[PDB]
Protein backbone atom coordinates (compact mmCIF):
# COMPACT_ATOMS: atom_id res chain seq x y z
CA UNK A 1 0.00 0.00 0.00
CA UNK A 2 1.29 3.43 -1.02
CA UNK A 3 0.14 5.02 2.24
CA UNK A 4 3.45 6.04 3.84
CA UNK A 5 3.27 9.67 4.97
CA UNK A 6 6.90 10.04 6.10
CA UNK A 7 8.28 10.90 2.64
CA UNK A 8 8.46 14.28 0.91
CA UNK A 9 6.09 15.08 -1.93
CA UNK A 10 6.96 17.03 -5.05
CA UNK A 11 3.71 18.98 -5.58
CA UNK A 12 3.28 22.36 -3.90
CA UNK A 13 1.13 25.43 -4.32
CA UNK A 14 -1.98 25.33 -6.49
CA UNK A 15 -2.91 23.76 -9.81
CA UNK A 16 -4.91 25.10 -12.74
CA UNK A 17 -7.94 22.84 -12.42
CA UNK A 18 -11.28 23.06 -14.20
CA UNK A 19 -12.69 24.66 -11.04
CA UNK A 20 -10.20 27.55 -11.15
CA UNK A 21 -11.08 28.12 -14.83
CA UNK A 22 -14.70 28.99 -14.01
CA UNK A 23 -14.68 32.26 -15.96
CA UNK A 24 -13.21 30.50 -19.01
CA UNK A 25 -15.59 27.52 -19.30
CA UNK A 26 -18.84 28.69 -20.94
CA UNK A 27 -22.36 27.33 -21.20
CA UNK A 28 -23.27 26.13 -24.68
CA UNK A 29 -26.55 26.59 -26.55
CA UNK A 30 -26.12 24.14 -29.43
CA UNK A 31 -29.12 25.50 -31.34
CA UNK A 32 -31.14 22.30 -30.89
CA UNK A 33 -34.55 22.39 -29.21
CA UNK A 34 -36.96 19.71 -28.00
CA UNK A 35 -40.31 19.67 -29.75
CA UNK A 36 -43.18 17.74 -28.28
CA UNK A 37 -44.15 14.54 -30.09
CA UNK A 38 -46.74 15.29 -32.76
CA UNK A 39 -49.96 13.28 -32.90
CA UNK A 40 -51.56 11.73 -35.99
CA UNK A 41 -54.73 13.31 -37.41
CA UNK A 42 -56.61 11.01 -39.79
CA UNK A 43 -60.28 11.68 -39.06
CA UNK A 44 -60.56 14.54 -41.56
CA UNK A 45 -59.80 12.10 -44.41
CA UNK A 46 -62.56 9.66 -43.35
CA UNK A 47 -65.43 12.16 -43.39
CA UNK A 48 -67.41 13.58 -46.31
CA UNK A 49 -66.23 17.18 -46.62
CA UNK A 50 -67.80 19.96 -48.66
Amino acid sequence: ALNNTTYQGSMRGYAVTKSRLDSFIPEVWTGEVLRALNQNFVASQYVKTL
Binding site: Q39, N40, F41, V42
Partner: protein, 151 residues
Protein backbone atom coordinates in the same frame (compact mmCIF):
# COMPACT_ATOMS: atom_id res chain seq x y z
CA UNK B 1 -47.90 38.71 -30.16
CA UNK B 2 -44.12 38.66 -30.53
CA UNK B 3 -41.98 41.58 -29.38
CA UNK B 4 -39.11 42.71 -31.60
CA UNK B 5 -36.65 43.00 -28.70
CA UNK B 6 -37.15 39.40 -27.60
CA UNK B 7 -36.98 38.09 -31.16
CA UNK B 8 -33.78 39.96 -32.04
CA UNK B 9 -31.80 38.54 -29.09
CA UNK B 10 -32.90 34.90 -29.05
CA UNK B 11 -30.78 32.51 -31.10
CA UNK B 12 -33.85 30.46 -32.06
CA UNK B 13 -36.51 31.26 -34.67
CA UNK B 14 -39.23 31.94 -32.12
CA UNK B 15 -41.86 33.08 -34.62
CA UNK B 16 -41.50 29.88 -36.66
CA UNK B 17 -41.99 27.73 -33.56
CA UNK B 18 -45.04 29.72 -32.49
CA UNK B 19 -46.56 29.54 -35.98
CA UNK B 20 -45.99 25.78 -36.17
CA UNK B 21 -47.53 25.29 -32.72
CA UNK B 22 -50.57 27.37 -33.66
CA UNK B 23 -51.11 25.43 -36.88
CA UNK B 24 -50.71 22.08 -35.13
CA UNK B 25 -53.14 23.16 -32.41
CA UNK B 26 -55.76 24.20 -34.96
CA UNK B 27 -55.41 20.93 -36.88
CA UNK B 28 -55.66 18.97 -33.63
CA UNK B 29 -58.77 20.89 -32.58
CA UNK B 30 -60.42 20.21 -35.94
CA UNK B 31 -59.55 16.51 -35.71
CA UNK B 32 -60.91 16.27 -32.16
CA UNK B 33 -64.13 18.04 -33.13
CA UNK B 34 -64.57 15.53 -35.95
CA UNK B 35 -63.89 12.61 -33.60
CA UNK B 36 -66.32 13.97 -31.01
CA UNK B 37 -69.24 12.89 -33.22
CA UNK B 38 -69.14 9.45 -31.58
CA UNK B 39 -71.33 11.06 -28.91
CA UNK B 40 -73.87 11.99 -31.60
CA UNK B 41 -73.69 8.45 -33.00
CA UNK B 42 -74.38 7.17 -29.48
CA UNK B 43 -77.30 9.59 -29.14
CA UNK B 44 -78.85 8.43 -32.41
CA UNK B 45 -80.30 5.36 -30.61
CA UNK B 46 -80.87 3.57 -33.93
CA UNK B 47 -78.77 0.55 -32.94
CA UNK B 48 -75.35 1.91 -33.98
CA UNK B 49 -73.95 1.28 -30.47
CA UNK B 50 -72.32 -2.01 -29.51
CA UNK B 51 -71.33 -2.80 -25.94
CA UNK B 52 -68.52 -5.36 -25.97
CA UNK B 53 -69.72 -7.03 -22.77
CA UNK B 54 -71.20 -10.42 -21.89
CA UNK B 55 -74.83 -9.27 -22.19
CA UNK B 56 -74.21 -6.34 -24.59
CA UNK B 57 -75.04 -3.83 -21.83
CA UNK B 58 -73.02 -1.40 -19.73
CA UNK B 59 -73.26 -3.54 -16.57
CA UNK B 60 -71.79 -6.74 -18.01
CA UNK B 61 -68.30 -8.22 -17.97
CA UNK B 62 -66.37 -5.92 -20.29
CA UNK B 63 -64.34 -7.48 -23.10
CA UNK B 64 -61.61 -5.99 -25.31
CA UNK B 65 -61.99 -5.29 -29.03
CA UNK B 66 -62.40 -8.84 -30.31
CA UNK B 67 -63.53 -10.73 -33.40
CA UNK B 68 -67.19 -10.89 -32.36
CA UNK B 69 -67.55 -7.13 -31.87
CA UNK B 70 -66.04 -6.37 -35.28
CA UNK B 71 -68.25 -8.99 -36.92
CA UNK B 72 -71.33 -7.52 -35.23
CA UNK B 73 -70.42 -4.01 -36.41
CA UNK B 74 -69.85 -5.31 -39.94
CA UNK B 75 -73.23 -7.06 -39.88
CA UNK B 76 -74.96 -3.91 -38.63
CA UNK B 77 -73.39 -1.89 -41.44
CA UNK B 78 -74.19 -4.52 -44.09
CA UNK B 79 -77.85 -4.81 -43.07
CA UNK B 80 -78.14 -1.06 -43.73
CA UNK B 81 -76.93 -1.35 -47.36
CA UNK B 82 -73.76 0.59 -46.48
CA UNK B 83 -71.22 0.16 -49.31
CA UNK B 84 -68.08 -1.84 -48.54
CA UNK B 85 -65.58 0.19 -50.57
CA UNK B 86 -64.80 3.16 -48.27
CA UNK B 87 -65.09 1.75 -44.75
CA UNK B 88 -62.61 2.40 -41.95
CA UNK B 89 -61.96 1.37 -38.35
CA UNK B 90 -60.62 4.18 -36.14
CA UNK B 91 -59.37 3.14 -32.71
CA UNK B 92 -56.90 4.05 -29.99
CA UNK B 93 -53.48 2.37 -29.81
CA UNK B 94 -54.92 0.29 -26.98
CA UNK B 95 -57.56 -1.03 -29.38
CA UNK B 96 -54.94 -1.70 -32.06
CA UNK B 97 -52.81 -3.69 -29.63
CA UNK B 98 -55.91 -5.54 -28.41
CA UNK B 99 -56.50 -6.54 -32.03
CA UNK B 100 -52.86 -7.67 -32.04
CA UNK B 101 -53.80 -10.26 -29.37
CA UNK B 102 -56.48 -12.11 -31.39
CA UNK B 103 -55.46 -15.36 -33.07
CA UNK B 104 -57.50 -14.84 -36.24
CA UNK B 105 -55.83 -11.48 -36.92
CA UNK B 106 -52.22 -12.59 -36.36
CA UNK B 107 -52.06 -16.23 -37.48
CA UNK B 108 -51.04 -17.17 -41.01
CA UNK B 109 -54.04 -19.53 -41.13
CA UNK B 110 -56.38 -16.53 -41.46
CA UNK B 111 -54.38 -13.52 -42.68
CA UNK B 112 -51.48 -13.07 -45.10
CA UNK B 113 -49.12 -10.96 -42.99
CA UNK B 114 -47.02 -11.24 -39.80
CA UNK B 115 -48.55 -8.84 -37.25
CA UNK B 116 -46.56 -10.41 -34.41
CA UNK B 117 -43.28 -9.87 -36.26
CA UNK B 118 -44.02 -6.43 -37.74
CA UNK B 119 -46.44 -4.98 -35.18
CA UNK B 120 -48.97 -3.92 -37.84
CA UNK B 121 -52.27 -5.66 -38.62
CA UNK B 122 -53.73 -5.50 -42.11
CA UNK B 123 -57.31 -5.08 -43.27
CA UNK B 124 -59.97 -6.74 -41.10
CA UNK B 125 -62.94 -8.03 -43.12
CA UNK B 126 -61.68 -5.80 -45.93
CA UNK B 127 -61.87 -2.70 -43.72
CA UNK B 128 -58.49 -1.03 -43.05
CA UNK B 129 -57.67 -0.39 -39.39
CA UNK B 130 -56.37 3.07 -38.51
CA UNK B 131 -54.67 3.91 -35.21
CA UNK B 132 -54.82 7.42 -33.78
CA UNK B 133 -53.67 8.79 -30.44
CA UNK B 134 -56.47 11.35 -30.64
CA UNK B 135 -58.84 8.57 -29.52
CA UNK B 136 -58.19 7.68 -25.88
CA UNK B 137 -59.90 6.14 -22.85
CA UNK B 138 -63.15 8.03 -22.29
CA UNK B 139 -62.52 10.17 -19.21
CA UNK B 140 -63.54 13.61 -17.97
CA UNK B 141 -59.97 14.71 -17.15
CA UNK B 142 -57.79 12.91 -19.73
CA UNK B 143 -57.48 15.67 -22.34
CA UNK B 144 -55.44 18.85 -22.69
CA UNK B 145 -55.90 22.10 -24.58
CA UNK B 146 -52.22 22.99 -24.68
CA UNK B 147 -49.48 23.27 -22.10
CA UNK B 148 -51.59 25.46 -19.79
CA UNK B 149 -55.11 23.97 -20.10
CA UNK B 150 -55.11 20.36 -18.89
CA UNK B 151 -57.70 18.06 -17.38
Amino acid sequence: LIEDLGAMQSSYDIRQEYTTEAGYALSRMMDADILGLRAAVKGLNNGSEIFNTADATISGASSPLNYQALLTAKTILDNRDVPMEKRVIITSPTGYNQLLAIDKFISMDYQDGRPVKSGVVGTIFGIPVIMTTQVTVNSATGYSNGSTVTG
